[PDB]
Design a protein around this ligand. Structure first.
Ligand SMILES: CCS(=O)(=O)c1ccc(Cl)cc1CNC(=O)c1cc(OC(F)(F)F)cc(N2CCNCC2)c1
Length: 293
């Protein structure tokens, strides 16, 4: 059953969509609803609401209803949660937790690595481990994300990370997608070679993108993957992975990244998809290192 729309109180616009908007809202008298809201009595309960325009087209309403159906399955501490929906009248609504530190690319971009806002090496590992645990969960569901990157991760309180999917809706990240007329829009610099050559997207290609997302984290989001290469060179490099003549190239080791952790990234970029580590091993490695450094 629907969330009570009358309890949602507009505060400000968080984002623009092609077909609607994302609003920051307060929930009036939320203890009543407790709908798995995270309620500290007498403290504002803030949620993000994705909202479809009242004049929304049939195509847009269909896509929203499918996004409700997909997101309704996802129940893990490191994945965006649907707290509720309002789908029986317009505008159609989907409600999620407000992640007050924004997307992870913006968050890390505002920090530098601590020198013996700053962030420590073990906390960077903890952020990456949370991402690997959320991806571990999605792999158990045979859910392929297809667009894992730090711009699609959200940051809450106490460095909590949740994986989400903004759906290529943002000017800020337009140069992270390769656009050709009549083709799917493609985040080529995070795509495994078989995705670029074949459209083959699998949990093994989500591991390759996790390798690139881990690179971004250890770069503190200071640089686009392959940022000195054109898009055409990035595509040509996918070709060199297939050709396997030893001319393919890889992201370089970030300044913050020890060689051991770099070798973990390199395994995620194995030419053979079956040589790439599973997310359960990636999580273990990063959490152990998070716990012990
Ligand atoms: C925070 C981003 S947002 O755009 O502000 C916003 C705000 C509130 C709400 Cl309720 C929803 C959203 C946006 N949709 C998502 O985040 C989301 C998360 C998903 O699950 C994850 F793949 F595992 F990531 C999957 C999807 N699918 C829609 C796109 N095709 C694939 C399935 C969307």
């Amino acid at each position: 059953v629907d969330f009570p729309r009358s309890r949602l109180r507009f505060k400000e616009k968080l984002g623009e969509g092609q077909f609607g908007e994302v609003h920051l809202c307060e929930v009036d008298s939320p203890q009543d609803l407790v709908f798995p809201l995270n309620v500290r009595k007498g403290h504002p309960l803030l949620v993000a609401v994705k909202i479809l325009r009242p004049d929304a087209t049939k195509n847009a309403r269909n896509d929203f209803l499918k996004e409700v159906k997909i997101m309704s399955r996802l129940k893990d501490p490191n994945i965006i949660r649907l707290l509720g929906v309002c789908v029986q009248d317009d505008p159609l609504c989907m409600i999620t937790d407000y992640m007050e530190n924004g997307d992870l690319n913006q968050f890390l971009s505002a920090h530098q690595l601590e020198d013996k806002p700053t962030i420590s090496y073990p906390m960077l590992l903890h952020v990456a481990a949370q991402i690997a645990s959320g991806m571990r969960y999605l792999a158990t569901l045979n859910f392929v994300h297809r667009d894992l990157a730090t711009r699609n991760c959200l940051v809450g309180e106490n460095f909590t990370i949740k994986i989400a999917d903004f759906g290529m809706s943002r000017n800020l990240y337009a140069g992270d997608y390769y656009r050709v007329q009549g083709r799917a829009v493609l985040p080529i610099r995070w795509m495994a070679w078989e995705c670029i050559l074949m459209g083959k997207f699998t949990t093994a290609s989500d591991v390759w993108a996790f390798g690139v997302t881990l690179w971004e984290v250890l770069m503190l989001c200071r640089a686009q993957p392959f940022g000195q290469l054109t898009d055409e060179q990035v595509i040509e490099n996918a070709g060199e992975f297939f050709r396997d003549q030893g001319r393919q190239v890889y992201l370089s080791r970030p300044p913050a990244c020890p060689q051991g952790l770099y070798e973990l990234m390199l395994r995620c970029w194995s030419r053979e998809s079956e040589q790439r580590p599973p997310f359960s091993q990636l999580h273990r490695f990063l959490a152990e290192d998070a716990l012990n450094t």
